[PDB]
Write an enzyme that holds these catalytic residues in place. Sequence first.
Site: not given
Ligand SMILES: CNc1nc(Nc2cn(C)nc2C)c(C(N)=O)nc1-c1cncc2c1ncn2C
Length: 285
Positions: A18-21, A24, A26, A41, A132
């Site tokens: 899904l992505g990351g940074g 971690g 995800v 994650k 953040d």
């Molecule tokens: C990539 N991060 C995330 N993506 C997610 N899902 C997603 C992303 N996309 C493009 N599409 C979907 C469906 C999700 C989730 N819970 O569904 N949780 C995160 C995430 C998790 N922990 C910390 C984070 C996160 N995000 C920023 N912090 C600081």
Amino acid sequence: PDIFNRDPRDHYDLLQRLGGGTYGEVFKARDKVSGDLVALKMVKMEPDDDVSTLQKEILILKTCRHANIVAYHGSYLWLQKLWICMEFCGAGSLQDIYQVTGSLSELQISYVCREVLQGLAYLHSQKKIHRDIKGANILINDAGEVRLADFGISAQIGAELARRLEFIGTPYWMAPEVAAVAGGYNELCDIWSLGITAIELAELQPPLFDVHPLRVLFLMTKSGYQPPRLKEKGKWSAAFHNFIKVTLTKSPKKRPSATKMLSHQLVSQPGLNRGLILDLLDKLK
Ligand SMILES: CNc1nc(Nc2cn(C)nc2C)c(C(N)=O)nc1-c1cncc2c1ncn2C
């Protein structure tokens, strides 16, 4: 019992990244028994990390629950990686959304700010500064509900050191009293970050985003730093401009708390509900 010494693949099918940074990596995953979707994650464990501290961090995730924070389900520790199972938020982050839809309406931003303020008021009551707040760290589920992706920067996890230092390359959402600490600041830094996020949802980037991050960091430390304002005056109501002016109060001794910000006219106007976000997701489809 939690933080199981096993591969998360024993219980889940990894579908896609899904992505990351710095926080971690995800992944979208599916519970093998129930079929429910989760986000998994992965966070690499450092040699100075210890499971006694890790157990305390996970205990905070288990006990501290709020409707405006993505729910924790459980965790794994496998081959020096901590895997956190969490609620899947189908629409992704507000940054993922506005990159496709363009700017959010003033009403849609008012709803997001009210929901984030509720999450922030909860964290600050638990003596936790998020540090953040930005569009990329605010997630939207398929019901149009607003969730903070996490509780913010972890105080004692090795991998989160890079996240704690990330403001050097990205200071645009940071309160000036944080940048100018190099005595102190407090939880009111998150109110400034929310103010910047509200401009980000309106303009698709925080103020001064195109300015080199090292230059921004220094400009915030200097005396005479003027808080940012909305760029297009005639596009926004006096209430939205006032909400920005108030959250972006330079002195934290004059900046209102997350709970007090909920009394603002912008976030207490009629017609604020998840239906506003469902309408935003309708532009996506
Ligand atoms: C990539 N991060 C995330 N993506 C997610 N899902 C997603 C992303 N996309 C493009 N599409 C979907 C469906 C999700 C989730 N819970 O569904 N949780 C995160 C995430 C998790 N922990 C910390 C984070 C996160 N995000 C920023 N912090 C600081």
